[PDB]
């Protein structure tokens, strides 16, 4: 709400459902699960969840940062837009997407083995592009993300991916004025949110979203076996709505599991 | 003068503007310049083009210096090598070489003169 | 009219890797005015007009007519012609002039005139100022070496 | 407490690195087997997976029959040891300006190779691209102190340095049984970042 | 157990080395066969690939029970020391050749020597017609020395094969001293001499003083 | 089996030879046909390339039934000793010609020698107008002598051809003595003697007793 | 003193600063110096340049000490050389040798004199 972070990667894998395909942003439950796995170690996640369950805790997925903050294309009412261009895009002439990251793909190996060729895609950022989560300024979050500097984000992360440099900044105005979370007019979820149920019936009627399917494993220390998550369909970073809704933190534990698998989907919005 | 631009296009233009046997109409239009007199100068610039790729430029100063001597001496013997080094501004391009990237430009310029000498007759 | 991308691949390289490095070539083939048959690499993207009439039936047929009615110049000559076509500064025009004239006097004098017409063809379309004939000659000699490989 | 202590080296090339490539196209007179590069920089890269697996196959000959490889490089099974506390990073060719000040045109070279048949004695040439000699790359390696680590911290440092004395004896790269590797770790130090730890005795140990 | 020992020696030469690099289309009067040279120092290398290939093909004449079509068909004595692509036991086989990098630029400059490579001028004479066709080929000069080093790894039970591997490796160095390493070969261009053949163990615990005597 | 045996000899010059040489940066008055020399001791060399090259073409008048017109048209006795490129079996053939180095440079100080080469003036006289055309060509001095190693491979493909090839080797060495080994040759400049023709095995086991009786005989 | 960066220009300036035929203006500007006498001067140095290449300076110092005397004796006989050993600083720059690469540079200076003498005349 109050303080945009800055992640400067220069090497990152961000998943997309495979290893052969990566994506240049990372869909806010990834950064929230990174913080949960960073507060599970240095054991602190009870404080981070008593903070996180509050309505003070907002969090927001990454958008590019090339000399200024970007926002998604709002889906409907005629790919990213700088904040200077969003009002001109709601008139809409041409805002063709420049290069933020080049998505390379490299074949790798496990030498002297039998089915050993895997292929890792990689967003290689173009020497100025950063990714900027927007979250509420809090010291616990700063101790968490200043060590996610050195643990990394997203992909392989122990083979040298997703490792950044955090450069916490104030939010520039005309982007702080339009983060609302309780509005009643033409609004845009710049997170990937999942509404509460009756609130979701309120959400579907004139919401212009994508769906995008957050899924596809639980990272644990208590199974010695990899169990699939509960395959959560969500909304997109575009996803215009009317009458701003209220999201969840959807427990997607693979049933009969020792702990919770949280999958942050509650929205910070953008007025338009 | 010759830059990293037209220095080869100079050399071709020097060869067509070089005197011929208007006489001797048994395979005519041939130069007075014999190609051995010109390969004996390409031999010098070829050893310098090879050593410039390896050694420094301060370690080629005496060697480069001797180049002018030979292009003078070969010009004082035959009149054909004399108008070779006059039509192709070789004594002037020799005074201009001060860096290894300019030494190699002169050393490739002489190869262009030999290449177009064989290409025409 | 249509725009193709042809990729050459070795034995048993996987079709997931093979159908993607060819989508790159046919989006590079869509990366000019209307259409192109982007051959083997990300360059070599010839328009279809300055292909079949101009590479596949003009230049490669003259290359094939030279190196099949003739005995002494082999793949070493074609290799050095491809190298001079791939580097190509103005100094390589001088080196190519010297090279072709120097090999012209190294044929059997019954094979000198066939070589001389081929020399004039290659030196004409190496220095042709259109800029297209060099690229077309390079791909045409690529094709002729890909035919005659044992 | 919690810490993330990073290691640091300029990793110098004593012969030429060949690493990698996805086999684009042969291009009849050009480089067969080009070296891996950076898409933005077009400079050679030592990728972090290539360092990580190489020094965990070097430690699978010393520290094998294991728990100590498993907790330093993860294990897909074995619920404790997933992302085992070592966070590699790609290496990024620091001294590019020095390579243009020593005087060189490209940062990679083409080595000409061949293969002579045992019967025919017919050659078969290759043009392998190498990342040229006396280049330094930036090597950093995050080791991650937690409480379960604080049981067993120091014997994970007699491995890491032991895992860096072996890349200086094996080759780190492609066809390095015949030259082509020979990497070195000049100016090898350690420091602590996010947390708080004492790396005085560690930095005396890294000699 | 595990160990890495290092064979260091000094490749002196006589009838100095042509070992070719780029046969790219050279200049009009210049060297036709340039020797392989380092990118920074512009000095010769005797690379590891030439040493390894020569020493296979010379030990393939000696230690093969049967003549091989290819390195895949080599004997296990050589397939374990030079690797084999096809045998599962012998992928990554026990020896690391390293490039050799001209130890004595300063000693050669102390002698009266301008360039570390000479260009020898050479020709072919046609048999009818007796035309001559010349050649300028580069040649790393005569009494240069080069830092040769091998690394031999000693794994799980390779320990019974250690001694009779080094009898092979020594023997291979005795065959390079009777053959030539590199280009043009049967016309001079070859003679090498391995000097100060010292085996030092580098990693692990092996007793090389019972072994360093074998290489004198 | 595998063996390598080594023909040693000592090349003695007579009217010593001129194997033509290097330098373009020479002079305006001095030596303009330089001789090939060691880059480090500046002593003259007989390179093994010129030894093999004269030896093939002098053995090829004798051992070719059909005329050559090229190497790789030699008659499978010279293809196996000097290599073809175009026989599958005769590419690396069986003979290594090392470069001969100046051996008696200390002996040629007991004789009054200022320098191990000499410069010799030579003068094309024109036959009309009688004008002269001088030159200073260098040559190694007369009693110079040279180490000569020549290494021979004996595999199983040398089944019974070792004696037949050593006939050819000692035929080529006595045929170089009737000819000149590089340089002007028709003007002096050539005459080479081979002394101390001695063959020893350097690798493998082979008998050199019966080899040194078509050498020295 | 003559250095590796100036000796050819010194030699050109010495051959120009050299007397000519004042009378006998049928083909004028001919020197009072002949080609044979200057090649006689270069003959003294041609058999030291080769040994500057081959062997050490400590066997050539004696021959340079007699080279001083050879230039003195050639200066004394004809007055044509006598006004060339002073114009070109030959006896001055002969005492300036002290090693191999100044002996070689002096021999190249003599060749530069001969080269510019052929080039002018």
Q: How far is C124 from chain B (nearest CA, A)?
A: 13
Half-sphere exposure of E180 (CA within 13 A, CB side): 27
Query: From the CB of residue E36, how many other CB atoms can be counted at a distance below 10 Å?
Result: 24
Cα angle value E209/E214/E215 (rounded, 5°): 100
Distance, in Å, from the CA atom of E28 to the CA atom of E22, rounded to the nearest integer, reads 16
Distance, in Å, from the CA atom of F152 to the CA atom of E186, rounded to the nearest integer, reads 10
Radius of gyration over alpha carbons of chain B, in Å? 15
Radius of gyration over alpha carbons of chain E, in Å? 20
Query: From the CB of residue C97, how many other CB atoms can be counted at a distance below 10 Å?
Result: 21
Counts for chain C of helices (H) and strands (E), in that order: 7, 2
Best mutation target among C77, C85, C93, C95 (most E Cβ atoms within 10 Å) is C95
3-state class of D57 per DSSP?
Answer: helix
Distance, in Å, from the CA atom of D4 to the CA atom of D83, rounded to the nearest integer, reads 14
Distance, in Å, from the CA atom of A155 to the CA atom of A140, rounded to the nearest integer, reads 24
Taking CB atoms and an 8 Å cutoff, what residues of chain F touch D121?
A: 91-92
Residue E102 tokens read as 């001209």
Length of chain G: 121
Distance, in Å, from the CA atom of A54 to the CA atom of E180, rounded to the nearest integer, reads 79
Phi–psi pair at F191, nearest 5 degrees: -75, 120
Q: How far is C139 from chain A (nearest CA, A)?
A: 28
The DSSP result for A87-136, as a single string, is HHHTT-S------SEEEEEEE---TT-SS---EEEEEEE-SS-B---EE-
Beta bridge partners of F150: F7, F97
- Contact assignment for E30 to B49 by CB distance below 8 Å: yes
Under 8 Å between Cβ of A267 and A31: no
Distance, in Å, from the CA atom of A26 to the CA atom of A61, rounded to the nearest integer, reads 6
Q: Nearest to residue A126, comparing CAs of A64, A83, A82?
A: A64
Cα angle value F72/F74/F80 (rounded, 5°): 85
Residue F20 gets which letter from DSSP? Answer: B
Taking CA atoms, B75 is separated from B65, B79, D198, G18, G109, in Å, by 16, 6, 78, 20, 17
Query: From the CB of residue C39, how many other CB atoms can be counted at a distance below 10 Å?
Result: 22
Residue B58 gets which letter from DSSP? Answer: G
Residue E77 tokens read as 């004595």
Sheet holding D86-87, edge to edge: D86-87, D136-145, D3-13, D183-193
The DSSP result for chain E, as a single string, is --EEEEEEEEEEESSPBP-B-------SSS-SBPBPB-TTT--B-B-HHHHHHHHHHHHHHHH-SS--SSGGGS-HHHHHHH--SS-TTSSS-SEEE--B--TTHHHHHHSS-S-SEEEEEEEEE-SSS--EEEEEEEEE-TT---EEEEEEEE-TT-GGGSHHHHHHHHHHHHHHSSS--SSSGGGS---EEEEEEEEEEEEE---GGGTTTTT-
Taking CB atoms and an 8 Å cutoff, what residues of chain C touch A106?
A: none
Under 8 Å between Cβ of D29 and C83: yes
- Contact assignment for E25 to C98 by CB distance below 8 Å: no
| CA D154 and chain centroid, separation | 23
Distance, in Å, from the CA atom of D129 to the CA atom of E125, rounded to the nearest integer, reads 37
How many domains in chain G? 1
Under 8 Å between Cβ of A238 and A209: yes
- Contact assignment for C41 to D29 by CB distance below 8 Å: no
Query: From the CB of residue C141, how many other CB atoms can be counted at a distance below 10 Å?
Result: 22
Distance, in Å, from the CA atom of A249 to the CA atom of A196, rounded to the nearest integer, reads 10
Phi–psi pair at E132, nearest 5 degrees: -110, 145
Query: From the CB of residue F135, how many other CB atoms can be counted at a distance below 10 Å?
Result: 12
Distance, in Å, from the CA atom of F4 to the CA atom of F96, rounded to the nearest integer, reads 10
Radius of gyration over alpha carbons of chain F, in Å? 20
Touching D: E residues 12-71, CB under 8 Å: 20-23, 36, 38-40, 47-49, 51-53, 57, 60, 67-71
The DSSP result for D96-157, as a single string, is HHHHHHH--S-SEEEEEE----TTT-----EEEEEEPTT-EEEEEEEEEE-HHHHHS-GGGH
Range of the domain at G40: 1-121
* Given resolution (angstroms): 3.0
Taking CA atoms, F8 is separated from C66, E142, F22, F163, F190, in Å, by 51, 20, 28, 17, 21
Under 8 Å between Cβ of A162 and A154: yes
Q: Compute the Cα dihedral for A69, A70, A71, A74 and give only its sign.
A: positive
Residue C94 tokens read as 């001088």
Phi–psi pair at D37, nearest 5 degrees: -140, 175
| CA A111 and chain centroid, separation | 35
Radius of gyration over alpha carbons of chain G, in Å? 15
3-state class of D2 per DSSP?
Answer: coil
The 3-class SS string of A189-238 reads ECCCCCECHHHHHHHHCCCECCCCCECCCCCCCCCCCCCCCCCECCCCCC
C103 to chain B, any CB pair closer than 8 A? The answer is no
Q: Are strands A269-271 and A187-189 parallel, antiparallel or unpaired?
A: antiparallel
Taking CA atoms, F125 is separated from F95, G36, G39, in Å, by 43, 18, 20
Distance, in Å, from the CA atom of D166 to the CA atom of D134, rounded to the nearest integer, reads 19
B39 to chain E, any CB pair closer than 8 A? The answer is yes
Q: Are strands C37-38 and C45-46 parallel, antiparallel or unpaired?
A: antiparallel
Taking CA atoms, C10 is separated from A110, D25, D78, G24, in Å, by 21, 9, 40, 85
Q: Which helix (H) or strand (E) holds B50?
A: helix B35-52
Under 8 Å between Cβ of E60 and E172: no
Beta bridge partners of E152: E5, E95
Interhelix angle C90-104/C112-124, rounded to 10 degrees, is: 170
- Contact assignment for F27 to G114 by CB distance below 8 Å: no
Q: How was this structure determined?
A: cryo-EM
Q: Are strands D136-145 and D3-13 parallel, antiparallel or unpaired?
A: antiparallel
F partners (3+ CB pairs within 8 A) are B, D, E, G
Query: From the CB of residue F23, how many other CB atoms can be counted at a distance below 10 Å?
Result: 16
The 3-class SS string of B103-121 reads HHHHHHHHHHHHHHHHHCC
The 3-class SS string of chain G reads CCCCCCHHHHHHHHHHCCCECCCCCCCCCCECCCHHHHHHHHHHHHHHHHHHHHCCCCCCHHHHHHHHHHHHHHHHHCHHHHCCCCCCCHHHHHCCCCCHHHHHHHHHHHHHHHHHHHHCC
Length of chain E: 216
Buried b (16+ CB within 10 A) or exposed e, D9-47: bbbbbebbbbbbbeeebebbbebbbbbbbbeeeebbbbb
Distance, in Å, from the CA atom of E140 to the CA atom of E155, rounded to the nearest integer, reads 38
Long-range CB pairs of C31-37, under 8 A, 24+ apart, other chains included: C34/C1, C34/C3, C35/C1, C35/C2, C35/C3, C36/C3, C36/C4, C37/C3, C37/C4, C37/C5, C37/C6
Distance, in Å, from the CA atom of D46 to the CA atom of D49, rounded to the nearest integer, reads 9
Under 8 Å between Cβ of A271 and A180: yes
**Chains F and A touch, using 3 or more CB pairs below 8 Å:** no
Residue B59 tokens read as 């370690």
Under 8 Å between Cβ of D90 and D96: no
Length of chain C: 150
Query: From the CB of residue C137, how many other CB atoms can be counted at a distance below 10 Å?
Result: 23
**What do you get for the CA distance between the two ends of chain F, in Å?**
28
Under 8 Å between Cβ of E11 and E148: yes
- Contact assignment for F30 to G39 by CB distance below 8 Å: no
Interhelix angle C75-87/C90-104, rounded to 10 degrees, is: 160
**What do you get for the CA distance between the two ends of chain D, in Å?**
26
Distance, in Å, from the CA atom of B19 to the CA atom of A59, rounded to the nearest integer, reads 84
Beta bridge partners of G80: none
For E17, counting Cβ atoms within 10 Å of its Cβ (0-12 exposed, 13-18 middle, 19+ buried), the class is: buried
Distance, in Å, from the CA atom of F72 to the CA atom of F85, rounded to the nearest integer, reads 6
Strand (E) positions, B10-121?
A: none
Query: From the CB of residue F105, how many other CB atoms can be counted at a distance below 10 Å?
Result: 15
Taking CB atoms and an 8 Å cutoff, what residues of chain C touch A21?
A: none
Distance, in Å, from the CA atom of D21 to the CA atom of D32, rounded to the nearest integer, reads 10
Distance, in Å, from the CA atom of A188 to the CA atom of D60, rounded to the nearest integer, reads 52
Q: Chain E residue with minimal CA distance to A112?
A: E91
Q: Compute the Cα dihedral for F40, F43, F44, F47 and give only its sign.
A: negative
Radius of gyration over alpha carbons of chain D, in Å? 19
Distance, in Å, from the CA atom of B41 to the CA atom of B72, rounded to the nearest integer, reads 11
Give the closest of B44, B63, B73 to F28, CB-based.
B73
Beta bridge partners of F151: F6, F96
Taking CB atoms and an 8 Å cutoff, what residues of chain G touch F119?
A: 47, 50
The DSSP result for F85-152, as a single string, is SS-SS-SS-SEEEPPEEB--TTHHHHS--SSSEEEEE-----SSS------EEEEE-TT-EEEEEEEE
Beta bridge partners of A15: none
Residue B53 tokens read as 């790729």
Distance, in Å, from the CA atom of E81 to the CA atom of E90, rounded to the nearest integer, reads 8
Distance, in Å, from the CA atom of G10 to the CA atom of D122, rounded to the nearest integer, reads 58
Residue E33 CB contacts under 8 Å (≥ 6 apart), including other chains: E18, E20, E23, E135, E137, E138, E183, E184
Distance, in Å, from the CA atom of C29 to the CA atom of D192, rounded to the nearest integer, reads 52
Buried b (16+ CB within 10 A) or exposed e, B33-61: beeebbeebbbbbbbbbbbbbebeeeebe
Q: Which helix (H) or strand (E) holds A271?
A: strand A269-271
Length of chain A: 272
Residue D43 gets which letter from DSSP? Answer: S
């Amino acid at each position: 709400t109050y303080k945009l972070y800055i992640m400067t990667f220069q090497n990152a894998h961000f998943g997309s459902g495979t290893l052969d395909s990566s994506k240049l942003t990372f869909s806010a439950d990834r950064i929230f699960s990174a913080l949960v796995l960073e507060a599970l170690k240095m054991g602190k996640l009870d404080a981070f969840l008593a903070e996180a369950n509050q309505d003070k805790f907002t969090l927001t997925d990454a958008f590019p940062f090339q000399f200024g903050p970007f926002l998604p294309k709002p889906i409907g009412y005629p790919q990213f837009l700088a904040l200077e261009n969003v009002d001109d895009y709601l008139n809409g002439e041409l805002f063709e997407n420049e290069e933020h990251a080049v998505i390379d793909t490299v074949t790798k190996n496990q030498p002297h083995k039998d089915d050993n060729l895997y292929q890792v895609a990689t967003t290689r950022f173009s020497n100025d592009t950063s990714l900027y989560v927007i979250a509420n300024e809090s010291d616990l979050l700063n101790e968490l993300m200043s060590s996610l500097q050195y643990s990394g984000l997203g992909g392989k992360r122990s083979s040298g991916f997703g490792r950044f440099e955090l450069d916490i900044q104030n939010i520039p105005l005309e982007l702080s004025d339009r983060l609302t979370k309780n509005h009643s007019d033409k609004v845009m979820s710049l997170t990937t949110a999942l509404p509460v149920d009756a609130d979701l019936e309120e959400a579907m009627e004139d919401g212009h979203y994508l769906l995008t399917k957050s899924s596809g494993f639980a990272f644990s220390h208590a199974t010695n076996e990899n169990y699939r998550k509960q395959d959560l369909y969500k909304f997109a970073s575009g996803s215009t709505f009317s009458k701003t809704f209220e999201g969840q933190i959807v427990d997607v534990r693979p049933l009969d599991f020792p702990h919770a698998v949280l999958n942050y989907a509650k929205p910070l919005f953008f007025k338009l | 003068i010759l830059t990293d631009e037209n220095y080869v296009d100079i050399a071709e233009k020097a060869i067509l503007k070089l005197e011929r046997n208007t006489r001797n109409r048994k395979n005519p239009d041939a130069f007075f310049l014999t190609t051995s007199k010109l390969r004996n100068l390409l031999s010098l610039t070829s050893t310098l083009f090879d050593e410039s790729k390896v050694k420094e430029y301060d370690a080629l100063l005496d060697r480069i210096a001797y180049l002018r001597v030979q292009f003078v001496y070969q010009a004082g013997r035959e009149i054909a090598v004399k108008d070779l080094i006059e039509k192709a501004q070789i004594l002037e391009a020799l005074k201009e070489i001060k860096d290894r990237e300019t030494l190699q430009r002169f050393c490739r310029y002489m190869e262009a003169l030999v290449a177009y000498f064989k290409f025409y007759g | 009219t249509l725009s193709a991308g042809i990729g050459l691949f070795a034995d048993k390289t996987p079709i997931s890797l093979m159908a993607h490095q060819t989508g790159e070539l046919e989006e590079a083939a869509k990366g000019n005015e209307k259409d192109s048959i982007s051959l083997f690499s990300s360059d070599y993207t010839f328009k279809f007009d300055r292909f079949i009439t101009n590479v596949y039936d003009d230049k490669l047929e003259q290359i094939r007519y030279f190196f099949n009615h003739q005995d002494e110049r082999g793949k070493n000559f074609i290799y050095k012609l491809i190298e001079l076509l791939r580097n190509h500064d103005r100094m390589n025009m001088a080196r190519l002039a010297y090279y072709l004239t120097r090999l012209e006097e190294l044929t059997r004098e019954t094979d000198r005139d066939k070589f001389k017409t081929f020399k004039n063809l290659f030196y004409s379309w190496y220095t042709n100022k259109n800029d297209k004939d060099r690229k077309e000659a390079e791909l045409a000699l690529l094709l002729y070496i890909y035919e005659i490989r044992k | 407490t919690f810490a993330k202590i990073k290691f640091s080296a300029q990793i110098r090339l004593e012969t030429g690195l060949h690493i990698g490539g996805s086999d684009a196209f042969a291009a009849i007179g050009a480089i067969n087997s080009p070296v891996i590069k950076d898409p933005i920089t077009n400079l050679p890269i030592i990728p972090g997976s290539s360092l990580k697996g190489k020094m965990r196959t070097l430690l699978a000959k010393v520290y094998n029959e294991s728990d100590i490889l498993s907790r330093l490089f993860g294990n897909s099974k074995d619920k404790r040891f997933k992302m085992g506390r070592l966070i590699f990073r790609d290496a990024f060719l620091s001294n590019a300006d020095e390579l243009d000040s020593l005087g060189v045109r490209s940062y990679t070279e083409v080595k000409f190779e061949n293969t002579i048949d045992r019967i025919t004695a017919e050659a078969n040439p290759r043009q392998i691209e190498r990342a040229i000699r006396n280049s330094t790359f930036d090597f950093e390696l995050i080791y991650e102190i937690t409480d379960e680590n604080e049981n067993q911290v120091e014997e994970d440092f007699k491995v890491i340095r032991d895992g860096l004395k072996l890349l200086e004896l094996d080759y780190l790269g492609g066809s390095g049984s015949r030259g082509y590797g020979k990497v070195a770790f000049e100016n090898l130090k350690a420091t602590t970042v996010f947390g708080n730890y004492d790396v005085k005795t560690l930095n005396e140990l890294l000699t």
